[PDB]
Nucleic acid binder design. Sequence first.
RNA 1: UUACUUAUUCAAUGAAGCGGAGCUGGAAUUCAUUUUCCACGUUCUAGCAUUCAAGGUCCCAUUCGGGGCUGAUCCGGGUUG
Lengths: 135, 96, 56, 91, 251, 116, 59
Amino acid sequence: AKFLKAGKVAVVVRGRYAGKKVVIVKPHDEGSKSHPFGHALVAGIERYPLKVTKKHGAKKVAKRTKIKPFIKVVNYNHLLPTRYTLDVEAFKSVVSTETFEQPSQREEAKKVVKKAFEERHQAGKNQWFFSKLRF
Amino acid sequence: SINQKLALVIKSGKYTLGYKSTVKSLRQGKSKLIIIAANTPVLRKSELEYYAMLSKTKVYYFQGGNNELGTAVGKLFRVGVVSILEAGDSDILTTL
Amino acid sequence: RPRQYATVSKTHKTVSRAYGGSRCANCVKERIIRAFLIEEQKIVKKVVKEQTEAAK
Amino acid sequence: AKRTKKVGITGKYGVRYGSSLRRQVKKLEIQQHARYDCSFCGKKTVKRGAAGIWTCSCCKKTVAGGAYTVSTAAAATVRSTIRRLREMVEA
Amino acid sequence: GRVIRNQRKGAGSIFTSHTRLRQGAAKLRTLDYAERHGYIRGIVKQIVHDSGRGAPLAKVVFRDPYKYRLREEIFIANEGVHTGQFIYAGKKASLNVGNVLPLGSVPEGTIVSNVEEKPGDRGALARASGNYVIIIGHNPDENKTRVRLPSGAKKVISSDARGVIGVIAGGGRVDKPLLKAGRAFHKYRLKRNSWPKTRGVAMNPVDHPHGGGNHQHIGKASTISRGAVSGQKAGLIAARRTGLLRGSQKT
Amino acid sequence: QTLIEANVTVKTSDDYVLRIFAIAFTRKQANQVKRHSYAQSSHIRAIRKVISEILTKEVQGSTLAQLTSKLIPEVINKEIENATKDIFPLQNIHVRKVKLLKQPKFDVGALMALHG
Amino acid sequence: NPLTHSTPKNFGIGQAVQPKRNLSRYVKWPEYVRVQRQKKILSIRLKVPPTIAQFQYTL
RNA sequence: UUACUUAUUCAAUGAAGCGGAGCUGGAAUUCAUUUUCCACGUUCUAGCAUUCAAGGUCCCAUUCGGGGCUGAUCCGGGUUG
């Protein structure tokens, strides 16, 4: 009956990324070394894309379709799970506990996640995930 | 009566008391029944409903406040929500 | 005092979270949860209305 | 501990104002200074700020209610009456 | 031989109301489109004590249907209305305590308060603490509603007049004896300059029609005609009857 | 002998509600040598509940004209007797006054239907 | 095309801010405009003597 | 007493939804189908709702953008009582 899968979509409600839609990709339910709690490795969107209309010719379109992601180790209690699910293949390999604690490949994984998120947003899919939570 | 079922569950099976514990149980998938008091705040009640929908567990609404739910569950404090993990001897999961 | 706030930099007047210098963490969390849950409630109510209209 | 036989809270008034007036004031003063259950959280935390203002400090809520009681008998009667009328209109 | 207390009160220099600490006029929202064609949902956000008034007031917030902004209204709080609560104002609102349904919308026997005398005057009847107006009946043709007023009175008013359903909060206040000239002093020092009152028989004949005499007596009958003029209307004005009552209100 | 009186407030599909009475008695059965033959005061409850159920079921799905046309032939008392024979024969269980508590609009079209 | 979506707001009684419609019917006109229109209205609403209605009979 | 409103009087509103007819359906079930009525997208939650609005459609002398109609029915300028 577990529903904290390695590919699900939640919203972070605590921390600097409060109210931000993220995809849980690596669930560490049975603790860890530096985080002996029930937590998860997730990849959210720090800056949502702006709405796109027929009245911009490709340039404002690219500017408003730019995506700025983030990766985070976050507690389950600070996570609010949602029924939506995101595909995790392009960055599951690049997101792991070893990629954390070290900013160089932290930014590298951020680049990979950014490329994947931009591709998946220009593709007309996962619009709820790529939309913005208003509160 | 439902109070008798709850007392039998207390005596026989396993349960957790409180919102934090019951949310933990719903996330870990070991909770089967979630009893929510009538006077539980609507935001908390809807959050528990969403968690139960996600984890495919059954939700029962106790017609009574947290004081009455604590009295039924046998403790002398307020419980706003209880989680039933195994009934032990009652048929509370099979009923209703 | 307000003029000291004017002369003080932005970091001390706010927190990095959304609604940083205006609302507390608990209130922000409660309103985020309320927003998401009420939107989900609205979606399921909309599909229920659609299906019952289609049936009738 | 019973320090006074029958004056209760009206020992502050001592001897003045008359026994009957002091008794009425006593009944209403215990009513207004009592602690009441909060229908939303279930804790005995509802105090009175002013007449008709009843604040629950634990859950940070305010309720409109009687001058010396959280809910008057008239308020309960009109609650029942409007509930009955609403149910009749609905069904 | 000199102007009397009520004559001075009418001029009203020191007899005006002390309105510094009042929280604004307690009126219902305007009847523009939504209150007469549907309902608008507002949040009662805060419940406060209005100084000089025995009933609490409610700071409520609605959304402006025409421009992006919030509109704050000062309602008279009904009993049971709590903070952060959805109240609903309009023709199609549900019969719940705190809602602002019109009289034509509420059914027979309903208990309403702060009811409008005419549609759009934002509340005129049953506004004091613990008071309410009962719906006695409806006349759909020439749409009208017969209601009972806290004075035990019958008034027939337009069915489009609104009123918040329930009873004014802060009831039973007058049940407590004031017990002290100090309590009366504070009450009236926040209300207006009308206390303490000296008795006309205690004043001098220059100061009052009741003044003068070697004994403190009124002298003439204390029932005054309705056609009497200013300075003469002291005592009982146009008293139909007089003396201790024995019976009921005949209603 | 014991009297049993019952009343129901059955809701009508024609936007009416019919308040209906029912009157029954216990009677000296054959082979009886007793003088009173009183019921056990719980039989009375059982007869009251069965009468209420049967009246409600019969009135439900019926209009005023159908109700009158089935009340006139005096078959309802025999139907009640048939349905409650098991506890007692129970003859003369007649169905007392029915009255409408409110009515819909003036129903000019219903008048044309009745007079056409 | 895959980036844009169907927003439409609902303009119900308490749904969303009403759109900027034509309020030319409800313009609080200047006083002289009001005198103009109401003077015409009064002239056509009163029973004019035949000298009017032999005028206003332009060829 | 009668079917009046324009004089006059009263009260509000940033003079915003007035009157009438139409889009859609539910009715007695229509003695032939606007003939009579109604509704004209919101009630478990102290969330949000604002860039001549997104979409749709036609036209683009085509730069980092637009124009008309629509979305948001039409007529009468009596702001409403």
